Amino acid sequence: DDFVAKLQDNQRFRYNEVMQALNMSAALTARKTKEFRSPPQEQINMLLNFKDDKSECPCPEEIRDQLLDFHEDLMTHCGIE
């Protein structure tokens, strides 16, 4: 619940700030908005593709930390470690 709330508000902020700089970027807005114009499942997988390095993920570290800590807690609950 709250993780996707944070992701949604962050994505709104990122879209807003990208639209702020579209004039100065000119044709350069393209790859940046490739993320914004994509199927929702692909958006989810791109936002979640930060498990092992792979810096090609727009999720900031302060939001990555929540998912990493919850994954650690889930693994401990499952008894993996």
Partner: protein, 67 residues
């Protein structure tokens, strides 16, 4: 494409649908990709014939759990 321009991202998607998509993506990319090596330890534990002193009889060699 007109439809691709009209279609809206997660921040316009409803909360519960976004949660469902996040759950599916989390299962696909984090839970499934997790690996932990337990086969060797499990097979050794199954092959270990235990409880010999509380058995105390050994009339016939009881088959181990792996057997």
């Amino acid at each position: 494409v007109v439809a691709c321009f009209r279609m809206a991202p997660l921040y316009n998607l409803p909360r519960h649908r976004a949660v469902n998509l996040f759950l599916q993506g989390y299962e696909k990319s984090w839970i499934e990709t997790e690996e932990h090596y337990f086969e060797d330890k499990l097979i050794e534990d199954l092959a270990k014939p235990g409880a010999e002193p509380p058995e105390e009889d050994e009339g016939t060699k009881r088959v181990d759990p792996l057997h």
